[PDB]
Design a protein around this ligand. Sequence first.
Ligand code: ADP
Ligand code: CL
Ligand code: K
Ligand code: MG
Length: 378
Amino acid sequence: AAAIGIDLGTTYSCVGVFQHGKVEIIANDQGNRTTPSYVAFTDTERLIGDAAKNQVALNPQNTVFDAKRLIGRKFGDPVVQSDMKHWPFQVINDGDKPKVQVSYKGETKAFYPEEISSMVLTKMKEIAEAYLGYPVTNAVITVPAAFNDSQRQATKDAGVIAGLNVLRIINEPTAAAIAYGLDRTGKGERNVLIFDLGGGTFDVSILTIDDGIFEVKATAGDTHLGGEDFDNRLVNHFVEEFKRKHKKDISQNKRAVRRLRTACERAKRTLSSSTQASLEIDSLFEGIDFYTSITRARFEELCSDLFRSTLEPVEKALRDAKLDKAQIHDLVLVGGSTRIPKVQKLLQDFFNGRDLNKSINPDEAVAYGAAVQAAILL
Ligand SMILES: Nc1ncnc2c1ncn2[C@@H]1O[C@H](COP(=O)(O)OP(=O)(O)O)[C@@H](O)[C@H]1O
Ligand SMILES: [Cl-]
Ligand SMILES: [K+]
Ligand SMILES: [Mg+2]
């Protein structure tokens, strides 16, 4: 009975298992090795993951995401008050705890963030069970290093609600380091930088590892910088292109923008492995189709300031850790956006040509380390 490692992510989640001497990251029913952290409520069903994200444009008020930004916080937390202004779903106050309010099967219902996250975890659990062939009961679940006691408590509660025995809650940067075997040496300090650029957040952690013991020396980043901001740059570019080509402005049609955004995320992912991508959106606006293309070089130009802004938190973290660049032994890429070639070039250039640890898909590295640690704990 194998235990699983679960990366419960702000925008995407990922599950792996250590079995037969190696980790396997487990693909979902659609074949995707990561699954959106989305939950949708309709007149007839609750949708989780791909099915939820794939109907987001049809159902914005009842499609919940970003629950990790709420989990374990009080309603009056300035983070909650700030973030809620920009979600299409309703957040309400139940005894100074936030709840998401939706319509489901014709009725108004509210859920605590940990309940939303428990549904995402249930999906990851079922993804693993379909692969393994038997029920899964034990798991390691990861959290950001910045999470406090209440946020860790609520993440553990999400796991309990999903029917998991949570063996340990471990930090995301620690899990990434474990994935690359960086905690296996004996006496001797090793300095590791984790550069984690995901869908919604950017986190830099500097760890010192000595005889298997992890010590956080410094952290930095931006909780509102990630792949979604690169998608948004492409969206605005294509809104302008559509205006020039058809003299129609689509920006106020919430459905057309959301569907253009989905095609932009897909093209962005293609540009990490090809130098050009095609977009073909049928009936984007008023029956007008939108068939166009984007080059990698144009994408880099549209995001050049955003990509470059990731280096200042690295500088700051090094300052706070009292370390020079050359004193970092390993540079570990985490998060789907670190697959972007320009991002890798910026970081490698900043470190004067140093190797990047990127042999594990960066959007899977946290789950991979979590799966290793789950096996060790058994
Ligand atoms: N090949 C790729 N190239 C560029 N971006 C990617 C690629 N694959 C995934 N992404 C982006 O990674 C982001 C999600 O990162 P991930 O680490 O999976 O989740 P999270 O941010 O929730 O931890 C999304 O913005 C997604 O579009
Ligand atoms: Cl699935
Ligand atoms: K993730
Ligand atoms: Mg992540």
